[PDB]
Amino acid sequence: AELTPEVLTVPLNSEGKTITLTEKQYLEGKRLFQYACASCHVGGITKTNPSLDLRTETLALATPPRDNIEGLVDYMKNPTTYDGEQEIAEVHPSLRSADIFPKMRNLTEKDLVAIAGHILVEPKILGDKWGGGKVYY
Amino acid sequence: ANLWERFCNWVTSTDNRLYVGWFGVIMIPTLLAATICFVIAFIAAPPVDIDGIREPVSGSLLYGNNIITGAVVPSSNAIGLHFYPIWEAASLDEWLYNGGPYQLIIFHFLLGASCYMGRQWELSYRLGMRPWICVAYSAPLASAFAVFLIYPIGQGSFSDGMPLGISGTFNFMIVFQAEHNILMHPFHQLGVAGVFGGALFCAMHGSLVTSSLIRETTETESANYGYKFGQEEETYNIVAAHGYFGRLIFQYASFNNSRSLHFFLAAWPVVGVWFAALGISTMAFNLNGFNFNHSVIDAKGNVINTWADIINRANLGMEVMHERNAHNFPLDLA
Amino acid sequence: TTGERPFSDIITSVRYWVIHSITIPALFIAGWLFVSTGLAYDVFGTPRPDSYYAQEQRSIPLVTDRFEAKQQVETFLEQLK
Amino acid sequence: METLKITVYIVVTFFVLLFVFGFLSGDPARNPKRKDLE
Amino acid sequence: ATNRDQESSGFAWWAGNARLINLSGKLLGAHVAHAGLIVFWAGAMTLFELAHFIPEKPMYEQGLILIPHIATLGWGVGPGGEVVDTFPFFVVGVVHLISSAVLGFGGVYHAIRGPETLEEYSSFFGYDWKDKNKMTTILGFHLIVLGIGALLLVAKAMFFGGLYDTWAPGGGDVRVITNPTLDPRVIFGYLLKSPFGGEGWIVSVNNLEDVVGGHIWIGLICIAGGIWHILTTPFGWARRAFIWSGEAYLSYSLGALSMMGFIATCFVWFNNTVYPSEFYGPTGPEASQAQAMTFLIRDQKLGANVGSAQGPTGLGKYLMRSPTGEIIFGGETMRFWDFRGPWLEPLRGPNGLDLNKIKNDIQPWQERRAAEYMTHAPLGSLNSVGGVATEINSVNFVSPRSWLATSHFVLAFFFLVGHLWHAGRARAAAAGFEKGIDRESEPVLSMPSLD
Amino acid sequence: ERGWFDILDDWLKRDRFVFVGWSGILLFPCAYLALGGWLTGTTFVTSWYTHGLASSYLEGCNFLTVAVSTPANSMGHSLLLLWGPEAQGDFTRWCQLGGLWTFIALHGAFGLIGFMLRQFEIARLVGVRPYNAIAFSAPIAVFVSVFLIYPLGQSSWFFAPSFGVAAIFRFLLFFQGFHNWTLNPFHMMGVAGVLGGALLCAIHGATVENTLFQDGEGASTFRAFNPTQAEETYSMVTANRFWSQIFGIAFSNKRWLHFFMLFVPVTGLWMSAIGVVGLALNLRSYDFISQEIRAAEDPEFETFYTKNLLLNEGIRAWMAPQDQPHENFVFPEEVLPRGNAL
Ligand code: CLA
Ligand code: CLA
Ligand code: CLA
Ligand code: CLA
Ligand code: CLA
Ligand SMILES: CC1=C(/C=C/C(C)=C/C=C/C(C)=C/C=C/C=C(C)/C=C/C=C(C)/C=C/C2=C(C)CCCC2(C)C)C(C)(C)CCC1
Ligand SMILES: CC1=C(/C=C/C(C)=C/C=C/C(C)=C/C=C/C=C(C)/C=C/C=C(C)/C=C/C2=C(C)CCCC2(C)C)C(C)(C)CCC1
Ligand SMILES: CC1=C(/C=C/C(C)=C/C=C/C(C)=C/C=C/C=C(C)/C=C/C=C(C)/C=C/C2=C(C)CCCC2(C)C)C(C)(C)CCC1
Ligand SMILES: CCCCCCCCCCCCO[C@@H]1O[C@H](CO)[C@@H](O[C@H]2O[C@H](CO)[C@@H](O)[C@H](O)[C@H]2O)[C@H](O)[C@H]1O
Ligand SMILES: [Ca+2]
Ligand SMILES: [Cl-]
Ligand SMILES: [Cl-]
Ligand SMILES: [Fe+2]
């Protein structure tokens, strides 16, 4: 088994376009996710609200859909509740709230794509371990 | 010689069957208080709400325990690290429900055993001895402070102190493994080397000295009658013992100097138990054992399990089952 | 003493070091190349990082028979494509 | 309880004072060899 | 080679520094050279921390223990503890580093070049351990030095920028202390508080007015006592209670250091005032409280009435009563209800946590702070995997509070052992039997039998 | 007669830097191969095909996590000879099948025999009583009971301890969850022997060092001892009085003291070995029936004994699928025992 281009091809948007990440992007995504997100999202769960995880099936059913690069990049700029009804930048790290979440201050557009790619690729690797919690450790 | 001088001469007298001494003045009342309360509570104490959830655990013999399952139960999680003497309860019945006796026993015990260490220093000074036997005893004593005082302070509750009982000890050890992975901590590992090594060198030194006893008796008598209490001459041949042990390994792996041999016998288990006590004492502040969970990963990113991951599976079972009604929120942070 | 030359004698002699300044690095390098050429993998049958699984499989290739264990492993090794 | 508390408070102070005055009562001199340690 | 071998000195090489006991010149050098090492580590470690420091991560995510000390004094930081200027950190490091060369120079000079004994060189700098007068005078000079040191903290607090105040209205800020607490009822009242839960002895100090005022008292006390000890010589009752030897004085200091190390361990573990959580991360109690706050907030937003939610045990799922009736967070954190922190106190009323404030007055900055502290609980492994012992690798984190508490418990413990070792030996040496029992004068043989 | 046997006897018993002896013919190859196999295996050999585990430096494990793991459960109790019907002479398959474990365990067993024969052989040549060899029976009883009898009672070698640091930790935890081994009074006696042995070690060494006679003028008291001196180097009389007054009782016989030091840890290890012989058969001290009968009928009755069984039940359900892969345990989330929230 190895990290092939097929593994690294992920949905770019909802219209069905894909994009293929380099191994560099994927690994950068992993480092940046550890930097800015893993304190709450380690392993694809959410420590401060375990009802919502980062599984692709969960992200597909969010509003708007978050199971693609554009959806996830938008979420890191302007996060919303699962139904899209409320904007939660004041309580969730984002570019819009980089003044109160200072670790977001040094994230570029290219960084957001890499973090997004890591979130979409990881379940293809780990399966149920991703978003599964302690039961699958 | 006035009365105070007479009293001081009796307290510090080297002719008492048991030495009293100034540490003894604190030791004797505190150890008696702890002993009497422990014995009574072990037999007759009613069940105690250890975890503060109105779920009393039965520790005493009269309430359904045997010698193996019985305990004095730690005081309530609702109390935390608050001081709970008898006179802070509205009744003895309240005090007992909330595990008052545990606090009374361990605080009196820890004072008594600390003065026991001082008393070891004090009698050596009265007898003209060298003073460091009490330093050897600091290793078991530090260990008792670790599980009765230090670990409660770091976790914020005497309800996480070690229970005063046999099966309660095993509970403490299993929950400790789930919450700190102590088996993977190098200070517990040095503690194991300390006590395995101590037991090894104990049998070793015993076997070597016994193997080289000078013939002084016939086959029908115990060889122990060949040594006479107070005799000037050594009772075994240390040159013979070294000649044997040095050939068992090689010559320079053997002690020929009794003084340095016996220093080694002191130092190894004492140093190792110091580290064991420092393990409990530093895991009291959640600096836990080595965590290698999912450390080995294949080329794609699959987790390749190791024995460390199997240990983690067992730790999870302990974690999810312990104190099964006491947690409402997803992380067990103390 | 049992007759052999003392160890402090030997390891402070120039000739000891003339010999062992060669033979010690030489063995060290032989151990390096045993790994770096990949030979250790094939001697002991240890998987390389890309050889624990097939690309899609997540099952362990566990030996389940006593007397065909050798064929089970050879079969598992073919199935790596 | 109040009587208990004063009783314990008194007993503890009694024993602690013995300890302190005891070790203040020329203790270095209470050894079998040299008895002049000032 | 004066006293530099075992035959001449009586001490083996592994006890070699005991050869210095009566060589005040070389003993001076060893002390100055060691002070150089301490100052060296302070400067060097600060520079290392600065080089590895990212302003926009929290300090406590970066393995920092010395920059947090500098920041608490008011340097480099602004509102909320945000780093505004790393140049103070640079200065502190460089100056300590430079100074260590001066101390190292003097240490190496006195240790191998200068006079081995000072007594023949100078009657002021020379000393006899047995000279009770000279010993309390050297003691006096250093009590005055120590007291100036405490007044310097006050001068910083009152005249040179102030201190970082985690309790400052607004979210925490540097604040000049203008009315330090001087009332000795308050200052020495801390000394008489119980050390048990809900009291916390001196670890419980929770405002900078008390911190600053306590150092004013300590400053005067030390300065006053140092003059007293220069001008006086030990009284008879003191002369008869102590051993008067170099090893004895060492053993008294070792006992004192052990006690301080244990106190310091508890200070960094429980106190979030002089160890602000902005810089050190939340305390253990703090993070546990913060988890209950987080889930009360989550569930109340989903529609739960948290005041009447009965949990599985029958105790409130979110809220309950402390043993004296105060309203407190439920679950296992019931043990931590003595916690106080600036993000939690606005929900507190006379009877504890106030249900009407919980329903109506929780601000988003509190939700953020509780979620931050709950996810930076001081739990982690020795290889710095953050989280519970069963957590998977991903987060590289061990709290500064755990590093500081464990290190100083270990050090305090070994200094208690050192006290016992050296105090026992000092007693035996003064009495004359530290080398063993005299065969022809064995005390036990002149004593009646026990039976 | 001075035939070849006596000539060989002479050479084997030469007083050299490392004594050889007849016992050395067995001891040295078997001890060397057992060690070399452990080092070989923990450096180069996997446990993928037997356990589903990486276990060597070559795979990225560290000193704490490397092991020579037991063979797969399907091998039963096979000797796993290299030339046997499983490996069929193939060195690589042999390693992948767990052959190194039987290799180490078997050569280790015969090496231990060799080491004990060496204690007898050297004691006979030097003229001492063989109490050192008698004391070594306890390590042999432990090794034989844990590494050979225990798995021979079970389904296969798989459940013997694997030769590694963390692997042994897993063995400790497996014995708590499945065997309730802390409850076993034979283990308890072993614990007393080991801890009491360490106690005796510290207290004897400390007592000697603190009742020394002043036999020299230096502050390092080590120098003031001569191996051929006739006098005791410390005062048994003062040692006796101190302990009588501190603790109530004391040793007065020095021969008894040192025999007791042999006796305590040796007897403890023998007792623990008997307990493990029972666990070979699952003959556990798992339960107190009276507790279970009361607890079944009275849901308000709780002791530390019932609390610990809940922990064991967690250990079993949560570690078993990964720890026993040949069983193919599929436990859905809904069946896993869990308390509230965790
Ligand atoms: C903080 C650590 C420390 C310090 C400050 C000292 C200091 C001292 N030791 Mg001790 N010692 C120590 C730890 C220390 N020791 C340890 C860990 C051991 C166990 C091995 C010993 C064992 C020991 C023994 C057995 C003896 C001493 C002795 C001494 C004294 C004389 C040394 C001498 O003459 O050597 C001369 C050495 C040299 C000439 C070689 C170089 C030494 C210099 C100072 C090194 C400086 C390097 C540094 C980078 C220079 C910076 C200069 C720059 C700032 C310009 C001196 C005061 C002796 C003594 O007590 O005499 C009365 C003695 O006999 N020590
Ligand atoms: C400021 C505190 C202080 C001072 C000034 C002294 C001074 C002295 N001690 Mg004391 N001691 C202390 C603290 C102190 N000690 C503590 C805290 C303990 C408890 C462990 C002791 C226990 C002790 C014993 C048991 C003895 C002394 C002795 C002495 C005398 C000789 C020391 C010597 O030359 O060592 C030489 C230094 C060494 C041999 C170095 C030891 C190396 C340590 C063990 C390594 C520690 C590891 C390190 C922290 C981390 C690893 C580093 C590595 C990875 C590179 C000297 C008067 C001797 C004596 O009685 O003389 C009267 C003696 O026998 N001390
Ligand atoms: C007050 C003491 C203290 C404390 C609390 C810390 C804490 C920290 N250090 Mg610092 N540091 C210290 C002293 C301290 N250090 C000293 C003396 C040095 C010079 C060696 C350093 C140089 C240093 C560097 C270069 C780095 C740190 C880093 C760190 C962080 C990670 C630590 C880690 O991963 O350890 C790993 C754990 C261990 C190494 C365990 C050590 C076990 C010891 C050897 C046991 C010894 C016990 C006792 C002393 C011996 C007793 C013997 C007995 C016989 C008496 C942590 C905040 C890292 C960081 O994050 O910087 C931002 C980092 O890169 N430190
Ligand atoms: C506190 C440690 C200490 C102590 C007790 C001494 C004591 C002594 N030194 Mg040493 N020395 C030290 C540190 C110390 N020195 C340091 C750090 C250095 C490197 C700079 C030296 C380098 C040195 C040399 C080269 C010589 C001495 C000499 C002497 C002797 C004569 C001193 C004198 O009368 O000067 C008169 C007093 C003064 C000039 C007052 C100086 C005031 C200072 C410089 C200003 C700052 C002081 C203030 C407290 C700053 C605080 C810094 C601190 C917080 C780090 C005396 C025994 C002489 C000697 O041994 O003769 C044989 C000698 O030749 N010393
Ligand atoms: C480095 C600090 C220091 C040291 C080592 C000394 C050392 C000494 N002082 Mg000095 N002193 C100091 C600072 C110091 N002093 C300061 C700052 C002042 C001004 C406040 C004084 C004012 C002073 C006076 C008036 C006298 C001394 C005296 C002495 C000598 C007798 C010590 C003694 O018997 O204590 C033993 C302590 C006691 C007997 C009281 C304690 C009572 C018991 C032990 C309970 C306390 C323990 C408890 C756990 C503490 C917890 C905290 C507490 C607040 C509750 C000794 C040489 C005596 C002397 O000979 O003068 C020439 C003396 O008469 N000192
Ligand atoms: C006596 C003795 C001893 C000891 C010694 C010692 C302890 C010493 C110390 C010493 C010291 C303590 C020294 C110090 C020094 C220092 C220095 C020399 C420094 C320098 C610095 C610098 C040069 C800086 C630089 C810089 C800057 C300025 C900027 C930033 C960056 C940098 C860093 C680059 C011993 C043990 C050996 C033994 C013998 C005797
Ligand atoms: C700064 C500060 C403060 C204050 C503080 C203070 C004010 C302190 C004081 C302190 C003190 C004031 C202390 C004291 C101590 C003492 C001690 C520690 C003692 C000891 C003693 C001893 C040890 C003795 C012994 C003995 C005996 C008993 C018998 C006889 C003999 C002898 C001598 C041995 C506060 C908290 C406000 C706040 C924060 C800051
Ligand atoms: C198995 C087998 C065999 C054998 C082989 C051998 C015999 C081998 C050997 C091998 C060897 C013989 C190896 C060795 C190795 C070693 C090592 C690898 C080491 C390392 C070390 C280290 C790493 C160290 C460390 C340390 C310590 C421990 C302590 C002190 C400090 C230090 C850190 C230094 C044969 C062919 C017969 C057959 C087939 C099977
Ligand atoms: C909270 C603790 C408060 C402690 C207060 C300490 C204040 C110190 C003031 C000095 C008090 C010391 O008072 C001490 O008492 C006894 C009498 O009772 C004296 O009498 C002593 O004399 C010699 C001293 O070598 C002894 O042999 C004798 O047994 C004893 O009677 C001590 O010589 C005296 O020093
Ligand atoms: Ca003076
Ligand atoms: Cl439990
Ligand atoms: Cl909870
Ligand atoms: Fe002995």
Q: Which of E269, E312, E427 sits opposite B154 (nearest CB)?
A: E269
Residue F210: closest CA among chain E residues belongs to which residue? E436
Nearest CB neighbour to F304, from listed B163, B199, B263: B163
CB contact under 8 A, B300 and C50: yes
CB neighbourhood size of E158 (10 A): 17
The one-letter amino acid code at F235 reads S
F213 inside 8 A of chain E by CB: yes
**Under a CB-based contact definition with an 8 Å cutoff, are residues B8 and D22 in contact?**
yes
Question: Pick from F151, D22, A72, B327: which is nearest to E315 by CA?
Answer: B327
Give, for ligand 7, the residue of E153, E191, E216, E275 to mutate: max count of ligand atoms closer than 8 Å to Cβ: E191
Which residues fall within 8 angstroms of residue E242, CB to CB, at 6 or more apart?
Answer: D28, E234, E248
B188 is in an annotated binding site: yes
CB E294 within 8 A of CB E343: no
Amino acid at E445: L
Distance from CA of E237 to the nearest CA of D (A): 8
Residue E297's identity, in one-letter code, is I
Structure tokens given for E368: 């953020």
Sign, CA dihedral B138-B140-B145-B146, equals positive
Are the C-beta atoms of A12 and A19 separated by less than 8 Å? Answer: yes
Task: Check CB contact under 8 Å for B298 and A47.
Answer: no
Instruction: Judge if the beta carbon of residue E153 lies within 6 A of ligand 7.
Output: no
Cβ neighbours of residue F247 closer than 8 Å, sequence gap 6 or more: none
Give the number of domains in chain A: 1
Backbone angles phi, psi at E86, to 5 degrees: -80, 0
Dihedral, CA of residue B207, residue B212, residue B217 and residue B219, to nearest 10: 60
Best probe of the C interface among B250, B300, B310, by most C CBs < 10 A, is B300
Closest CA to F301 of A121, B55, B286: B55
Nearest-CA neighbor of E326 among E311, E347, E300? E347
Report F:232-291 residues touching C (Cβ under 8 A).
none
Which chain E residues have a beta carbon less than 8 Å from that of F241?
A: 444, 447, 450
Closest by Cα among F91, A33, F58 to B304: F58
∠ at Cα C54 (C48, C60), nearest 5°?
Answer: 85
Question: In chain C, whose CA is at the least distance from the CA of A126?
Answer: C58
3-class DSSP assignment, residue E146: helix
- CB nearest to F210's CB, from B133, B227, B257: B133
What 3-state DSSP class applies to A114? helix
Q: Which of D4, D15, D31 sits opposite B29 (nearest CB)?
A: D15
Q: Inter-chain contact B302–C2, Cβ cutoff 8 Å?
A: no
What is the Cα Rg of chain C in Å?
23
- Is F311–B321 a contact, with Cβ atoms under 8 angstroms apart? yes
**C-beta of B5 in contact with ligand 9 (< 6 A):** yes
Q: Smallest Cα–Cα separation from C64: which of F297, F83, F51, F218?
A: F51
Q: Closest approach of chain E CAs to the CA of A112, in angstroms? A: 17
Q: Which domain holds residue B26?
A: 3-186
For F41, the domain range is: 1-342
Cβ neighbors of E393 (< 8 A, separation 6 or more) are B291, B292, B293, B294, B295, E385
CB atoms within 10 A of CB B2: 7
The residue nearest atom 15 of ligand 6, judged by CA position, is E101
Closest residue of chain C to F322, computed from CA coordinates: C60
CA of B92 to the centre of ligand 9 (A): 41
Query: Is residue E202 within 6 Å of ligand 7 at its C-beta?
Result: yes
- On whether the CB atoms of residues C64 and F84 are closer than 8 A, the answer is no
Which residues in chain E touch residue A42, judged by CB atoms under 8 angstroms apart?
Answer: 387, 391-392, 394-395
Q: Which two tokens stand for residue B129?
A: 């001895």
Q: Which of E191, E192, E235, E237 to mutate to test the pocket of ligand 9 (most atoms within 8 A of CB)?
A: E237
- Residue C20 annotated as part of some ligand binding site: yes
**Continuous H helices in E160-240:** 184-191, 208-231, 236-239
Cβ atoms of F212 and E429 within 8 Å: the answer is no
Number of Cβ within 10 Å of residue C31's Cβ equals: 12
The count of other CB atoms within 10 Å of the CB of residue C29 is 11
Residue F334: other Cβ atoms inside 10 A: 5
Ligand closest in space to the Cα of E40: 6
Resolution in A: 2.3
- E333: nearest Cα among B300, B77, F295: B77
Q: What residue type is assigned to position E312 of the chain?
A: P
Ligand 5 lined by E260 (C-beta under 6 Å): no
> Is E7's Cβ below 8 Å from some Cβ in B?
no
Cβ of E237 below 6 Å from ligand 5:
no
CA F68 to CA F62: how far, in whole Å?
Answer: 13
Residue B52 Cα to ligand 12 middle (Å): 12
Is residue E3 within 6 Å of ligand 1 at its C-beta?
yes
Q: Which atom of ligand 3 is nearest to the CA of E384?
A: 34
Taking an 8 Å cut-off on Cβ atoms, the answer to whether E442 and F221 are in contact is no
Where are chain E's structural domains?
1-281+378-451, 282-377
Tell me which residue of E139, E132, E166 sits closest to E341, measured CA to CA. Answer: E166
Contacts of B257 (CB under 8 A, 6+ apart): F222, F225, F227
Nearest to F235 among E435, E437, E450 (CB): E437
Residue D31 forms contact with E (CB below 8 Å): yes
- Tell me whether residues B302 and A137 touch, CB distance under 8 A: no
Whether B187 contacts B272, CB under 8 Å? no
Enumerate the β-bridge partners of residue F67.
F164
CB-facing half-sphere around the CA of B23: CA atoms within 13 A: 19
- Tell me the pairing of strands E327-329 and E319-321: antiparallel
The alpha-carbon gap from E208 to the nearest alpha carbon of chain A, in Å, equals: 26
The amino acid that residue F199 corresponds to is: L
CA distance B182 to chain A (A): 19
E255 lines ligand 5 (CB under 6 A): no
Measured between alpha carbons, how far is E397 from A72 in angstroms, rounded to an integer? Answer: 26
Please give the distance, rounded to the nearest whole angstrom, from the Cα atom of residue B87 to the centre of ligand 10.
48
CB distance F154 to F280 below 8 Å:
yes
What is the rounded distance in angstroms from the CA atom of residue F24 to the CA atom of residue F118? 7
Helix spans in chain B (H) = 3-11, 21-44, 92-97, 100-127, 133-145, 151-155, 166-180, 186-211, 238-248, 258-283, 307-321
Three-state secondary structure along chain F? CCCHHHHHHHHHCCCCCCCCCCHHHHHHHHHHHHHHHHHHHHHHCCEHHHHCECCCHHHCCCCCCCEECCCCHHHCCCCCCCCCCCCCCCHHHHHHCCHHHHHHHHHHHHHHHHHHHHHHHHHHHHCCCCHHHHHCHHHHHHHHHHHHHHHHHCCCHHHCCCEEHHHHHHHHHHHHHHHCHHHCHHHHHHHHHHHHHHHHHHHHHHHHHCCEECCCCCCCHHHCCCCCCCECCECHHHHHHHHHHHHCCCCCCHHHHHHHHHHHHHHHHHHHHHHHHHHHCCCCCCCCHHHHHHHHHCCCCCCHHHHHHHHHHHHHHHHHHHHCHHHCCCCCHHHCCCCCCC
Distance CA F24, CA E325 (A): 76
Virtual CA dihedral for E322, E325, E326, E329, nearest 10 degrees? 40
Angle at which helix F99-126 crosses helix F137-144, to 10 degrees, equals 170
Residue nearest to atom 64 of ligand 2 (CA): E15
Residue written as token pair 């889930």: E295
F211 shares contact with chain E (CB less than 8 Å): yes
Residue nearest to ligand 5 atom 51, measured at CA: E191
Nearest to C4 among F17, F86, F97 (CB): F17
CA–CA dist F190, A17 (Å, integer): 68
Bridge partners for E77 per DSSP = E83
Ligand nearest to the CA of B172: 11
On whether the C7-79 domain is CATH 3.30.1330.60, my answer is no
Q: Which residue has the tokens 């080397």?
A: B193
> D1 and B8 in contact by Cβ < 8 A?
no
Domain total of chain F: 1
